[PDB]
């Protein structure tokens, strides 16, 4: 049931994607206690996506299923900045 | 208004996609009584999508617009297993 | 926070996409008063997407964040018909 979708205009290689998603899955499992075997995740390369009118690198993260989402947001932002080289200020996490 | 989106990590050929979607549209029209001319459908190939940490074939179906969704879920699962060769246990249908 | 996603089966060139999205962003900023710097937009080419069972050109627009959405819908429809050569009757705008 828990989902995490990372939409990005960064053309992540197949391995960059696995790096980001495995780390986010681990983060969700750790902070929220959800088993890895129930988690669905994806990195959706959207070459046209824009934020603020700019095509500069940007990630939009949707996490579906809560005081600790502050912590989870922090881990996710650090993960994407590392794996995809996105600016933290251009990582936006939405919880649903 | 009624939508059905099949997200999958299975690289369905153009015709496999039409096979799956025409059959799902027929199923929605039959079980829910919605005219085919109002239905929107799609198969979104998401090469990075993961379930349980695995890239093994998997489909996530979202149907938007209800005792019979049990029946509709059953028809959709059988359809995808046939057309895309996905394991029934790796077909997940969500209604909204 | 405000998002606009245009999903379409029309294989828009990179520039057609920028033409459509910059104009929609301007429309959202003007009608709804949202600053361009807060708006996220995207055009998602979905080659399998169907409406009414047909693969004829079609756009599904989701705008997330209201008497004027009638006006905003009108501007968006005219924009896509111009930039992507879609029939107005095959442009569907959903607000959320």
PDB file of C-alpha atoms in Angstrom:
ATOM      1  CA  UNK A   1       0.000   0.000   0.000  1.00  0.00           C
ATOM      2  CA  UNK A   2       2.716   2.567   0.816  1.00  0.00           C
ATOM      3  CA  UNK A   3       3.989   4.218  -2.356  1.00  0.00           C
ATOM      4  CA  UNK A   4       6.800   6.617  -3.100  1.00  0.00           C
ATOM      5  CA  UNK A   5       7.030   8.212  -6.516  1.00  0.00           C
ATOM      6  CA  UNK A   6       9.958  10.459  -7.387  1.00  0.00           C
ATOM      7  CA  UNK A   7       9.157  12.501 -10.480  1.00  0.00           C
ATOM      8  CA  UNK A   8      12.194  14.300 -11.901  1.00  0.00           C
ATOM      9  CA  UNK A   9      13.480  16.053 -14.987  1.00  0.00           C
ATOM     10  CA  UNK A  10      16.959  14.613 -14.245  1.00  0.00           C
ATOM     11  CA  UNK A  11      17.831  11.858 -16.720  1.00  0.00           C
ATOM     12  CA  UNK A  12      18.966   9.401 -14.079  1.00  0.00           C
ATOM     13  CA  UNK A  13      20.850   6.358 -15.282  1.00  0.00           C
ATOM     14  CA  UNK A  14      19.364   2.963 -14.523  1.00  0.00           C
ATOM     15  CA  UNK A  15      21.746   2.576 -11.612  1.00  0.00           C
ATOM     16  CA  UNK A  16      21.287   6.096 -10.220  1.00  0.00           C
ATOM     17  CA  UNK A  17      17.608   5.310 -10.094  1.00  0.00           C
ATOM     18  CA  UNK A  18      18.177   2.068  -8.194  1.00  0.00           C
ATOM     19  CA  UNK A  19      20.533   3.880  -5.835  1.00  0.00           C
ATOM     20  CA  UNK A  20      17.946   6.561  -5.056  1.00  0.00           C
ATOM     21  CA  UNK A  21      14.978   4.188  -4.772  1.00  0.00           C
ATOM     22  CA  UNK A  22      16.619   1.514  -2.626  1.00  0.00           C
ATOM     23  CA  UNK A  23      17.756   4.209  -0.215  1.00  0.00           C
ATOM     24  CA  UNK A  24      14.344   5.856  -0.087  1.00  0.00           C
ATOM     25  CA  UNK A  25      12.685   2.469   0.467  1.00  0.00           C
ATOM     26  CA  UNK A  26      15.047   1.802   3.348  1.00  0.00           C
ATOM     27  CA  UNK A  27      14.254   5.253   4.737  1.00  0.00           C
ATOM     28  CA  UNK A  28      10.508   4.717   4.540  1.00  0.00           C
ATOM     29  CA  UNK A  29      10.851   1.271   6.127  1.00  0.00           C
ATOM     30  CA  UNK A  30      12.971   2.649   8.939  1.00  0.00           C
ATOM     31  CA  UNK A  31      11.108   5.849   9.802  1.00  0.00           C
ATOM     32  CA  UNK A  32       7.576   4.573   9.165  1.00  0.00           C
ATOM     33  CA  UNK A  33       8.085   0.915  10.029  1.00  0.00           C
ATOM     34  CA  UNK A  34       6.562  -0.341   6.769  1.00  0.00           C
ATOM     35  CA  UNK A  35       8.027  -3.647   5.522  1.00  0.00           C
ATOM     36  CA  UNK A  36      10.066  -3.409   2.370  1.00  0.00           C
ATOM     37  CA  UNK A  37       7.951  -6.192   0.836  1.00  0.00           C
ATOM     38  CA  UNK A  38       4.835  -3.984   0.873  1.00  0.00           C
ATOM     39  CA  UNK A  39       6.454  -0.832  -0.578  1.00  0.00           C
ATOM     40  CA  UNK A  40       6.033   0.299  -4.183  1.00  0.00           C
ATOM     41  CA  UNK A  41       8.453   2.871  -5.527  1.00  0.00           C
ATOM     42  CA  UNK A  42       9.326   4.499  -8.800  1.00  0.00           C
ATOM     43  CA  UNK A  43      11.439   7.206 -10.374  1.00  0.00           C
ATOM     44  CA  UNK A  44       9.544   8.761 -13.279  1.00  0.00           C
ATOM     45  CA  UNK A  45      11.745  10.684 -15.684  1.00  0.00           C
ATOM     46  CA  UNK A  46       9.654  13.549 -17.006  1.00  0.00           C
ATOM     47  CA  UNK A  47      11.844  15.387 -19.448  1.00  0.00           C
ATOM     48  CA  UNK A  48       9.461  18.372 -19.758  1.00  0.00           C
ATOM     49  CA  UNK A  49       8.887  19.000 -16.064  1.00  0.00           C
ATOM     50  CA  UNK A  50       9.333  22.565 -14.833  1.00  0.00           C
ATOM     51  CA  UNK A  51       9.451  24.316 -11.508  1.00  0.00           C
ATOM     52  CA  UNK A  52       9.224  28.061 -11.298  1.00  0.00           C
ATOM     53  CA  UNK A  53       9.340  28.074 -15.091  1.00  0.00           C
ATOM     54  CA  UNK A  54      12.819  26.527 -15.058  1.00  0.00           C
ATOM     55  CA  UNK A  55      14.057  23.200 -16.397  1.00  0.00           C
ATOM     56  CA  UNK A  56      16.879  23.239 -13.880  1.00  0.00           C
ATOM     57  CA  UNK A  57      17.016  19.919 -12.043  1.00  0.00           C
ATOM     58  CA  UNK A  58      14.043  19.314  -9.749  1.00  0.00           C
ATOM     59  CA  UNK A  59      12.392  16.376  -7.965  1.00  0.00           C
ATOM     60  CA  UNK A  60       8.789  16.059  -6.822  1.00  0.00           C
ATOM     61  CA  UNK A  61       8.270  13.228  -4.324  1.00  0.00           C
ATOM     62  CA  UNK A  62       4.835  11.874  -3.469  1.00  0.00           C
ATOM     63  CA  UNK A  63       4.596   9.469  -0.530  1.00  0.00           C
ATOM     64  CA  UNK A  64       1.232   7.730  -0.051  1.00  0.00           C
ATOM     65  CA  UNK A  65      -0.249   5.359   2.497  1.00  0.00           C
ATOM     66  CA  UNK A  66       2.979  11.324  11.190  1.00  0.00           C
ATOM     67  CA  UNK A  67       5.206  13.621  13.296  1.00  0.00           C
ATOM     68  CA  UNK A  68       8.322  12.066  11.748  1.00  0.00           C
ATOM     69  CA  UNK A  69       7.623  12.929   8.105  1.00  0.00           C
ATOM     70  CA  UNK A  70       9.830  15.914   8.939  1.00  0.00           C
ATOM     71  CA  UNK A  71      12.599  13.373   9.470  1.00  0.00           C
ATOM     72  CA  UNK A  72      11.581  11.347   6.433  1.00  0.00           C
ATOM     73  CA  UNK A  73      11.524  14.465   4.286  1.00  0.00           C
ATOM     74  CA  UNK A  74      15.051  15.260   5.483  1.00  0.00           C
ATOM     75  CA  UNK A  75      16.374  11.796   4.601  1.00  0.00           C
ATOM     76  CA  UNK A  76      14.723  11.812   1.178  1.00  0.00           C
ATOM     77  CA  UNK A  77      16.075  15.252   0.302  1.00  0.00           C
ATOM     78  CA  UNK A  78      19.609  14.261   1.288  1.00  0.00           C
ATOM     79  CA  UNK A  79      19.293  11.034  -0.712  1.00  0.00           C
ATOM     80  CA  UNK A  80      18.220  12.688  -3.956  1.00  0.00           C
ATOM     81  CA  UNK A  81      20.786  15.466  -3.652  1.00  0.00           C
ATOM     82  CA  UNK A  82      23.423  12.767  -3.346  1.00  0.00           C
ATOM     83  CA  UNK A  83      22.282  10.363  -6.037  1.00  0.00           C
ATOM     84  CA  UNK A  84      20.910  12.787  -8.633  1.00  0.00           C
ATOM     85  CA  UNK A  85      22.849  15.945  -7.735  1.00  0.00           C
ATOM     86  CA  UNK A  86      19.663  18.000  -7.278  1.00  0.00           C
ATOM     87  CA  UNK A  87      19.622  21.156  -5.140  1.00  0.00           C
ATOM     88  CA  UNK A  88      17.876  20.561  -1.795  1.00  0.00           C
ATOM     89  CA  UNK A  89      15.771  23.645  -2.488  1.00  0.00           C
ATOM     90  CA  UNK A  90      14.536  21.940  -5.683  1.00  0.00           C
ATOM     91  CA  UNK A  91      13.389  18.796  -3.857  1.00  0.00           C
ATOM     92  CA  UNK A  92       9.729  18.937  -2.831  1.00  0.00           C
ATOM     93  CA  UNK A  93       8.128  16.133  -0.802  1.00  0.00           C
ATOM     94  CA  UNK A  94       4.339  15.751  -0.542  1.00  0.00           C
ATOM     95  CA  UNK A  95       2.661  13.287   1.817  1.00  0.00           C
ATOM     96  CA  UNK A  96      -0.680  11.608   1.093  1.00  0.00           C
TER      97      UNK A  96
ATOM     98  CA  UNK B   1     -14.728  10.912 -16.251  1.00  0.00           C
ATOM     99  CA  UNK B   2     -13.944   7.251 -15.470  1.00  0.00           C
ATOM    100  CA  UNK B   3     -10.222   6.582 -15.801  1.00  0.00           C
ATOM    101  CA  UNK B   4      -8.110   3.463 -15.665  1.00  0.00           C
ATOM    102  CA  UNK B   5      -4.348   3.767 -15.546  1.00  0.00           C
ATOM    103  CA  UNK B   6      -2.171   0.662 -15.629  1.00  0.00           C
ATOM    104  CA  UNK B   7       1.349   1.508 -14.503  1.00  0.00           C
ATOM    105  CA  UNK B   8       3.834  -1.298 -15.161  1.00  0.00           C
ATOM    106  CA  UNK B   9       7.526  -2.052 -15.395  1.00  0.00           C
ATOM    107  CA  UNK B  10       6.745  -4.554 -18.198  1.00  0.00           C
ATOM    108  CA  UNK B  11       7.874  -3.194 -21.567  1.00  0.00           C
ATOM    109  CA  UNK B  12       4.624  -3.975 -23.335  1.00  0.00           C
ATOM    110  CA  UNK B  13       4.644  -3.771 -27.105  1.00  0.00           C
ATOM    111  CA  UNK B  14       2.278  -1.313 -28.740  1.00  0.00           C
ATOM    112  CA  UNK B  15      -0.132  -4.131 -29.480  1.00  0.00           C
ATOM    113  CA  UNK B  16       0.094  -5.790 -26.054  1.00  0.00           C
ATOM    114  CA  UNK B  17      -0.893  -2.447 -24.634  1.00  0.00           C
ATOM    115  CA  UNK B  18      -3.908  -2.154 -26.929  1.00  0.00           C
ATOM    116  CA  UNK B  19      -4.876  -5.726 -26.090  1.00  0.00           C
ATOM    117  CA  UNK B  20      -4.779  -5.042 -22.347  1.00  0.00           C
ATOM    118  CA  UNK B  21      -6.492  -1.642 -22.513  1.00  0.00           C
ATOM    119  CA  UNK B  22      -9.324  -2.572 -24.872  1.00  0.00           C
ATOM    120  CA  UNK B  23     -10.131  -5.545 -22.661  1.00  0.00           C
ATOM    121  CA  UNK B  24     -10.024  -3.494 -19.474  1.00  0.00           C
ATOM    122  CA  UNK B  25     -12.230  -0.825 -21.069  1.00  0.00           C
ATOM    123  CA  UNK B  26     -14.737  -3.493 -22.027  1.00  0.00           C
ATOM    124  CA  UNK B  27     -14.588  -4.843 -18.475  1.00  0.00           C
ATOM    125  CA  UNK B  28     -15.189  -1.442 -16.917  1.00  0.00           C
ATOM    126  CA  UNK B  29     -18.047  -0.764 -19.342  1.00  0.00           C
ATOM    127  CA  UNK B  30     -19.641  -4.108 -18.582  1.00  0.00           C
ATOM    128  CA  UNK B  31     -19.287  -4.279 -14.800  1.00  0.00           C
ATOM    129  CA  UNK B  32     -19.788  -0.575 -14.070  1.00  0.00           C
ATOM    130  CA  UNK B  33     -22.072   0.313 -16.966  1.00  0.00           C
ATOM    131  CA  UNK B  34     -19.941   3.267 -18.087  1.00  0.00           C
ATOM    132  CA  UNK B  35     -20.056   3.949 -21.849  1.00  0.00           C
ATOM    133  CA  UNK B  36     -16.855   3.262 -23.702  1.00  0.00           C
ATOM    134  CA  UNK B  37     -17.008   6.774 -25.192  1.00  0.00           C
ATOM    135  CA  UNK B  38     -16.534   8.365 -21.751  1.00  0.00           C
ATOM    136  CA  UNK B  39     -13.639   6.146 -20.584  1.00  0.00           C
ATOM    137  CA  UNK B  40     -10.004   7.259 -20.531  1.00  0.00           C
ATOM    138  CA  UNK B  41      -7.341   4.596 -20.223  1.00  0.00           C
ATOM    139  CA  UNK B  42      -3.597   4.304 -20.385  1.00  0.00           C
ATOM    140  CA  UNK B  43      -0.715   1.916 -19.873  1.00  0.00           C
ATOM    141  CA  UNK B  44       2.267   3.816 -18.479  1.00  0.00           C
ATOM    142  CA  UNK B  45       5.561   1.991 -18.875  1.00  0.00           C
ATOM    143  CA  UNK B  46       7.677   2.921 -15.877  1.00  0.00           C
ATOM    144  CA  UNK B  47      10.965   1.156 -16.345  1.00  0.00           C
ATOM    145  CA  UNK B  48      12.191   1.920 -12.796  1.00  0.00           C
ATOM    146  CA  UNK B  49       9.097   0.824 -10.900  1.00  0.00           C
ATOM    147  CA  UNK B  50       9.618  -1.546  -7.979  1.00  0.00           C
ATOM    148  CA  UNK B  51       7.440  -3.579  -5.685  1.00  0.00           C
ATOM    149  CA  UNK B  52       8.848  -5.115  -2.558  1.00  0.00           C
ATOM    150  CA  UNK B  53      12.242  -3.888  -3.730  1.00  0.00           C
ATOM    151  CA  UNK B  54      12.045  -6.094  -6.828  1.00  0.00           C
ATOM    152  CA  UNK B  55      11.969  -5.183 -10.510  1.00  0.00           C
ATOM    153  CA  UNK B  56      10.158  -8.415 -11.270  1.00  0.00           C
ATOM    154  CA  UNK B  57       7.103  -7.709 -13.411  1.00  0.00           C
ATOM    155  CA  UNK B  58       4.368  -5.788 -11.592  1.00  0.00           C
ATOM    156  CA  UNK B  59       1.267  -3.754 -12.475  1.00  0.00           C
ATOM    157  CA  UNK B  60      -0.410  -1.037 -10.428  1.00  0.00           C
ATOM    158  CA  UNK B  61      -3.936  -0.235 -11.632  1.00  0.00           C
ATOM    159  CA  UNK B  62      -5.783   2.901 -10.575  1.00  0.00           C
ATOM    160  CA  UNK B  63      -9.475   3.128 -11.467  1.00  0.00           C
ATOM    161  CA  UNK B  64     -11.144   6.507 -10.863  1.00  0.00           C
ATOM    162  CA  UNK B  65     -14.655   7.884 -11.168  1.00  0.00           C
ATOM    163  CA  UNK B  66     -19.321  -0.457  -5.669  1.00  0.00           C
ATOM    164  CA  UNK B  67     -19.871  -4.047  -4.454  1.00  0.00           C
ATOM    165  CA  UNK B  68     -18.720  -5.396  -7.826  1.00  0.00           C
ATOM    166  CA  UNK B  69     -15.208  -3.922  -7.845  1.00  0.00           C
ATOM    167  CA  UNK B  70     -14.331  -7.354  -6.453  1.00  0.00           C
ATOM    168  CA  UNK B  71     -15.506  -8.710  -9.798  1.00  0.00           C
ATOM    169  CA  UNK B  72     -13.834  -5.912 -11.733  1.00  0.00           C
ATOM    170  CA  UNK B  73     -10.579  -6.486  -9.887  1.00  0.00           C
ATOM    171  CA  UNK B  74     -10.786 -10.172 -10.826  1.00  0.00           C
ATOM    172  CA  UNK B  75     -11.316  -9.431 -14.528  1.00  0.00           C
ATOM    173  CA  UNK B  76      -8.505  -6.874 -14.629  1.00  0.00           C
ATOM    174  CA  UNK B  77      -6.035  -9.200 -12.919  1.00  0.00           C
ATOM    175  CA  UNK B  78      -6.830 -12.030 -15.328  1.00  0.00           C
ATOM    176  CA  UNK B  79      -6.500  -9.647 -18.282  1.00  0.00           C
ATOM    177  CA  UNK B  80      -3.054  -8.352 -17.358  1.00  0.00           C
ATOM    178  CA  UNK B  81      -1.745 -11.803 -16.480  1.00  0.00           C
ATOM    179  CA  UNK B  82      -2.807 -12.902 -19.944  1.00  0.00           C
ATOM    180  CA  UNK B  83      -1.625  -9.957 -22.007  1.00  0.00           C
ATOM    181  CA  UNK B  84       1.537  -8.981 -20.124  1.00  0.00           C
ATOM    182  CA  UNK B  85       2.392 -12.290 -18.431  1.00  0.00           C
ATOM    183  CA  UNK B  86       2.416 -10.721 -14.950  1.00  0.00           C
ATOM    184  CA  UNK B  87       1.882 -12.826 -11.817  1.00  0.00           C
ATOM    185  CA  UNK B  88      -1.604 -12.292 -10.347  1.00  0.00           C
ATOM    186  CA  UNK B  89       0.047 -11.668  -6.984  1.00  0.00           C
ATOM    187  CA  UNK B  90       1.967  -8.777  -8.596  1.00  0.00           C
ATOM    188  CA  UNK B  91      -1.189  -7.083  -9.903  1.00  0.00           C
ATOM    189  CA  UNK B  92      -2.570  -4.479  -7.499  1.00  0.00           C
ATOM    190  CA  UNK B  93      -5.825  -2.632  -8.232  1.00  0.00           C
ATOM    191  CA  UNK B  94      -6.772   0.578  -6.396  1.00  0.00           C
ATOM    192  CA  UNK B  95     -10.182   2.224  -6.722  1.00  0.00           C
ATOM    193  CA  UNK B  96     -10.753   5.979  -6.439  1.00  0.00           C
TER     194      UNK B  96
ATOM    195  CA  UNK C   1       2.321  23.972  -4.470  1.00  0.00           C
ATOM    196  CA  UNK C   2       0.149  24.663  -7.542  1.00  0.00           C
ATOM    197  CA  UNK C   3       0.694  21.996 -10.189  1.00  0.00           C
ATOM    198  CA  UNK C   4      -0.476  21.577 -13.747  1.00  0.00           C
ATOM    199  CA  UNK C   5       0.095  18.291 -15.519  1.00  0.00           C
ATOM    200  CA  UNK C   6      -0.864  17.889 -19.167  1.00  0.00           C
ATOM    201  CA  UNK C   7      -0.986  14.212 -20.083  1.00  0.00           C
ATOM    202  CA  UNK C   8      -1.260  13.624 -23.833  1.00  0.00           C
ATOM    203  CA  UNK C   9      -0.845  10.986 -26.501  1.00  0.00           C
ATOM    204  CA  UNK C  10       0.447  13.715 -28.870  1.00  0.00           C
ATOM    205  CA  UNK C  11       4.196  13.363 -29.411  1.00  0.00           C
ATOM    206  CA  UNK C  12       4.956  17.013 -28.779  1.00  0.00           C
ATOM    207  CA  UNK C  13       8.399  18.227 -29.743  1.00  0.00           C
ATOM    208  CA  UNK C  14      10.577  19.673 -27.009  1.00  0.00           C
ATOM    209  CA  UNK C  15       9.661  23.166 -28.131  1.00  0.00           C
ATOM    210  CA  UNK C  16       5.927  22.509 -28.545  1.00  0.00           C
ATOM    211  CA  UNK C  17       5.974  21.355 -24.963  1.00  0.00           C
ATOM    212  CA  UNK C  18       7.704  24.523 -23.772  1.00  0.00           C
ATOM    213  CA  UNK C  19       5.266  26.602 -25.803  1.00  0.00           C
ATOM    214  CA  UNK C  20       2.251  24.910 -24.213  1.00  0.00           C
ATOM    215  CA  UNK C  21       3.627  24.887 -20.660  1.00  0.00           C
ATOM    216  CA  UNK C  22       4.909  28.464 -20.548  1.00  0.00           C
ATOM    217  CA  UNK C  23       1.535  29.666 -21.791  1.00  0.00           C
ATOM    218  CA  UNK C  24      -0.391  27.557 -19.297  1.00  0.00           C
ATOM    219  CA  UNK C  25       1.866  28.764 -16.472  1.00  0.00           C
ATOM    220  CA  UNK C  26       1.195  32.347 -17.488  1.00  0.00           C
ATOM    221  CA  UNK C  27      -2.529  31.574 -17.580  1.00  0.00           C
ATOM    222  CA  UNK C  28      -2.522  30.027 -14.122  1.00  0.00           C
ATOM    223  CA  UNK C  29      -0.487  32.941 -12.751  1.00  0.00           C
ATOM    224  CA  UNK C  30      -2.847  35.465 -14.287  1.00  0.00           C
ATOM    225  CA  UNK C  31      -6.232  33.923 -13.497  1.00  0.00           C
ATOM    226  CA  UNK C  32      -5.343  32.450 -10.099  1.00  0.00           C
ATOM    227  CA  UNK C  33      -2.715  34.962  -9.015  1.00  0.00           C
ATOM    228  CA  UNK C  34      -0.125  32.292  -8.184  1.00  0.00           C
ATOM    229  CA  UNK C  35       3.498  33.404  -8.697  1.00  0.00           C
ATOM    230  CA  UNK C  36       5.311  31.709 -11.524  1.00  0.00           C
ATOM    231  CA  UNK C  37       8.139  30.811  -9.122  1.00  0.00           C
ATOM    232  CA  UNK C  38       5.841  28.513  -7.114  1.00  0.00           C
ATOM    233  CA  UNK C  39       4.259  26.689 -10.086  1.00  0.00           C
ATOM    234  CA  UNK C  40       5.224  23.175 -11.173  1.00  0.00           C
ATOM    235  CA  UNK C  41       4.179  22.038 -14.622  1.00  0.00           C
ATOM    236  CA  UNK C  42       4.739  19.129 -16.934  1.00  0.00           C
ATOM    237  CA  UNK C  43       3.664  17.619 -20.227  1.00  0.00           C
ATOM    238  CA  UNK C  44       3.684  13.829 -19.944  1.00  0.00           C
ATOM    239  CA  UNK C  45       3.721  12.049 -23.285  1.00  0.00           C
ATOM    240  CA  UNK C  46       1.768   8.840 -22.820  1.00  0.00           C
ATOM    241  CA  UNK C  47       1.893   7.064 -26.132  1.00  0.00           C
ATOM    242  CA  UNK C  48      -0.751   4.470 -25.150  1.00  0.00           C
ATOM    243  CA  UNK C  49      -3.362   6.846 -23.769  1.00  0.00           C
ATOM    244  CA  UNK C  50      -6.913   6.437 -25.051  1.00  0.00           C
ATOM    245  CA  UNK C  51     -10.152   8.329 -24.787  1.00  0.00           C
ATOM    246  CA  UNK C  52     -13.394   6.746 -25.835  1.00  0.00           C
ATOM    247  CA  UNK C  53     -11.326   3.811 -27.063  1.00  0.00           C
ATOM    248  CA  UNK C  54      -9.560   6.030 -29.604  1.00  0.00           C
ATOM    249  CA  UNK C  55      -5.902   6.981 -29.934  1.00  0.00           C
ATOM    250  CA  UNK C  56      -6.894  10.168 -31.713  1.00  0.00           C
ATOM    251  CA  UNK C  57      -5.128  13.133 -30.129  1.00  0.00           C
ATOM    252  CA  UNK C  58      -6.307  13.910 -26.597  1.00  0.00           C
ATOM    253  CA  UNK C  59      -5.088  15.887 -23.574  1.00  0.00           C
ATOM    254  CA  UNK C  60      -5.970  15.359 -19.922  1.00  0.00           C
ATOM    255  CA  UNK C  61      -5.063  18.343 -17.731  1.00  0.00           C
ATOM    256  CA  UNK C  62      -4.908  18.118 -13.951  1.00  0.00           C
ATOM    257  CA  UNK C  63      -4.552  21.382 -12.029  1.00  0.00           C
ATOM    258  CA  UNK C  64      -3.862  21.062  -8.288  1.00  0.00           C
ATOM    259  CA  UNK C  65      -3.503  23.465  -5.388  1.00  0.00           C
ATOM    260  CA  UNK C  66     -12.691  29.069  -7.780  1.00  0.00           C
ATOM    261  CA  UNK C  67     -15.412  30.680  -9.942  1.00  0.00           C
ATOM    262  CA  UNK C  68     -12.833  31.504 -12.624  1.00  0.00           C
ATOM    263  CA  UNK C  69     -11.667  27.958 -13.381  1.00  0.00           C
ATOM    264  CA  UNK C  70     -14.268  28.257 -16.142  1.00  0.00           C
ATOM    265  CA  UNK C  71     -12.054  30.997 -17.557  1.00  0.00           C
ATOM    266  CA  UNK C  72      -8.876  29.061 -16.839  1.00  0.00           C
ATOM    267  CA  UNK C  73     -10.295  25.976 -18.515  1.00  0.00           C
ATOM    268  CA  UNK C  74     -11.091  28.099 -21.575  1.00  0.00           C
ATOM    269  CA  UNK C  75      -7.556  29.507 -21.798  1.00  0.00           C
ATOM    270  CA  UNK C  76      -5.947  26.093 -21.347  1.00  0.00           C
ATOM    271  CA  UNK C  77      -8.119  24.477 -24.013  1.00  0.00           C
ATOM    272  CA  UNK C  78      -7.323  27.224 -26.515  1.00  0.00           C
ATOM    273  CA  UNK C  79      -3.614  26.937 -25.695  1.00  0.00           C
ATOM    274  CA  UNK C  80      -3.373  23.194 -26.278  1.00  0.00           C
ATOM    275  CA  UNK C  81      -5.463  23.324 -29.442  1.00  0.00           C
ATOM    276  CA  UNK C  82      -3.015  25.900 -30.751  1.00  0.00           C
ATOM    277  CA  UNK C  83       0.270  24.348 -29.689  1.00  0.00           C
ATOM    278  CA  UNK C  84      -0.521  20.645 -30.085  1.00  0.00           C
ATOM    279  CA  UNK C  85      -3.339  20.802 -32.650  1.00  0.00           C
ATOM    280  CA  UNK C  86      -5.749  18.872 -30.402  1.00  0.00           C
ATOM    281  CA  UNK C  87      -9.525  19.144 -30.840  1.00  0.00           C
ATOM    282  CA  UNK C  88     -11.106  21.275 -28.092  1.00  0.00           C
ATOM    283  CA  UNK C  89     -13.584  18.458 -27.506  1.00  0.00           C
ATOM    284  CA  UNK C  90     -10.617  16.162 -26.754  1.00  0.00           C
ATOM    285  CA  UNK C  91      -9.177  18.482 -24.094  1.00  0.00           C
ATOM    286  CA  UNK C  92     -10.382  17.635 -20.587  1.00  0.00           C
ATOM    287  CA  UNK C  93      -9.400  19.769 -17.583  1.00  0.00           C
ATOM    288  CA  UNK C  94      -9.775  18.495 -14.004  1.00  0.00           C
ATOM    289  CA  UNK C  95      -9.265  20.703 -10.953  1.00  0.00           C
ATOM    290  CA  UNK C  96      -7.967  19.422  -7.609  1.00  0.00           C
TER     291      UNK C  96
END
